[PDB]
Design a binder for this molecule. Structure first.
Ligand SMILES: CCCCCC(=O)CC(=O)N[C@H]1CCOC1=O
Ligand SMILES: [Fe+3]
Ligand SMILES: [Fe+3]
Ligand SMILES: [O-]
Ligand SMILES: [O-]
Ligand SMILES: [Zn+2]
Lengths: 323, 323
């Protein structure tokens, strides 16, 4: 009935229109060592974050889930300044990135000692039920991630921990899948360990353009997220055209109570600034929090999709997810 | 004539007896995501770090090189509090850990963009000549590391950047070798790119018990460090008895002006505390900052090593290295 946000418990009935996967801040593990040339600029990162919040608000969004992993710049007090300022509900995560874009040494060492999976459980339970650091903020979701073509033995520790914490807390799990692989594998493995499919979102499912792969994942009763709209031409991601063609096929099959959409924006990169070459930079040009509402959703409406299907995905599914 | 310490420039001639490789603070990358259960207890860490400084001072140590990589908990202002309190000279580093036990994603991302090597050079130059973060502390050494049996292409970026920053600054390079591999490879590749052998310390050389490999490395004119005394069992490392037999062989061969000794201690672990399982726990019991003076040097003196040779290793070589 309630979900923990960066501003404390909010009734699930009041979450409203929700973007299921956006980052206000994100840094790739390793950004911490580049502090000298990549200092966190708090005032300017707040104004950009707050502006992103305002743009989402102009398209009706009342709630963002920000699943930034723990060592990737997750900053609950920062998110609370965004939420206090804009009135947006923001739900944060507890979780670690996949091995390929992570820093596994800390928990690999604890796996050597035989305490890793229990330690991850402990962290999940502390941040879900007591709070993150001294912020007073509980994560509302557990974030999981797997590698391309594999859920590594390291990653499996987090999956089992997440299942155990879900059984005890009822917390929503949100996953990352790499390059359109392991959707069905994630669902089956979470279910193996007693996780509840009604509380699981298998993410980055737009990374795969075969509706059969999607159906194999949906068959577990989990949600799937087409959560990378705008990301085109980079690290294996397909085009928004193929995302839409895949989604339309799922919607015409009646799967809208299982689908949620997002962009996976990074509104403020942590570490040193960068610029993409315009081959990439012009194809990444629609990767912003308004893209679903200015480019994608209208196109869907012009291909048959009704308002009540959109409301199911943006409003009904989050409400069901968190309750 | 001077080297930058955590308390500013210190004349090289006053460095005195020096431990070339110890960590006051250290965490494995990823420790940052365990902030809730693994928070940094700064007042107790200072107490522990200062006591370690006092134990080292009790055996005549005036200077410690602390080569904690940038994303491994390097904390110049903390080290300065240690140095201010104890009068110990503390020299810190700029650098990143090797691929195996690091967080490669951040600079892998910039390598894809084509700026990584230059960015690493910029970082080295900024931390060597302007200051780390806002601490006002310059690193006095570049810290490099390679993987087991390979200097990876990612690692090679840092080697090349370090040679470039050495050419411009004359700064000392201190390396990590993994499991007794790549000693000769590191020296040759650094020299290939114009680095100065008299400013390079090839570390963790005690990981290899074959004096032919040490001689292969010393042939480049670099320093080598037997810098993990007390580490037994873990990370495949040899025993201290094996360390002493290899050392004694090179000393009886006349290589004292190329050799430095240290323990690579971690006086305060970052992240969540841990207890070593009793097997490793007993083998690791000598891994503390007094071990060389209390156990190793006595055995060496029993074996005929004279005080002048020890003074060469502890005083003469650090002075030559930094001068
Ligand atoms: C405008 C900046 C574009 C560069 C971002 C990029 O490289 C694409 C990408 O990997 N996606 C980002 C988003 C979330 O985590 C990632 O890895
Ligand atoms: Fe994401
Ligand atoms: Fe070390
Ligand atoms: O992500
Ligand atoms: O080390
Ligand atoms: Zn090392």
């Amino acid at each position: 009935e309630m979900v923990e946000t960066v501003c404390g418990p909010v009734p699930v009935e009041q979450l409203g229109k929700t973007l299921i996967h956006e980052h206000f801040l994100f840094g790739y593990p390793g950004f911490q060592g580049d502090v000298t040339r990549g200092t966190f600029r708090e005032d300017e990162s707040l104004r950009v974050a707050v502006e992103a919040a305002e743009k989402m608000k102009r398209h009706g969004i009342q709630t963002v889930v920000d699943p930034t992993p723990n060592d990737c710049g997750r900053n609950p007090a920062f998110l609370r300044r965004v939420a206090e300022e804009t009135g947006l509900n923001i739900i944060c995560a507890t979780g670690y990135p996949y091995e390929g874009e992570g820093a596994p040494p800390y928990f690999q060492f604890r796996r050597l000692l035989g305490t890793a999976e229990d330690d991850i459980y402990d962290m999940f339970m502390a941040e879900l039920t007591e709070g993150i650091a001294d912020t007073g903020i509980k994560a509302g979701v557990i974030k999981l991630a797997s590698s391309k073509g594999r859920i590594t033995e390291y990653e499996k520790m987090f999956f089992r921990a997440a299942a155990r914490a879900q059984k005890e807390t009822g917390a929503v799990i949100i996953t990352h899948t790499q390059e359109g692989t392991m959707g069905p594998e994630q669902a089956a493995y979470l279910l193996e360990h007693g996780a509840d499919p009604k509380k699981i979102v298998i993410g980055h499912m737009c990374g795969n353009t075969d509706p059969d792969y999607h159906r194999k994942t949906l068959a577990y009763g989990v949600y799937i997220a087409f959560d990378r709209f705008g990301i085109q031409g980079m690290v294996g991601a397909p085009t928004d055209e193929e995302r839409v063609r895949t989604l339309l096929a799922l919607l015409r099959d009646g799967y809208e109570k299982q689908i949620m959409l997002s962009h996976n924006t990074v509104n403020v990169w942590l570490g040193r600034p960068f610029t993409l070459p315009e081959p990439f930079a012009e194809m990444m040009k629609n990767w912003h929090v308004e893209h679903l509402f200015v480019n994608i959703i209208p196109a869907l409406k012009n291909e048959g999709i009704r308002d009540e299907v959109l409301e199911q995905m943006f409003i009904g599914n989050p409400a069901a997810l968190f309750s």
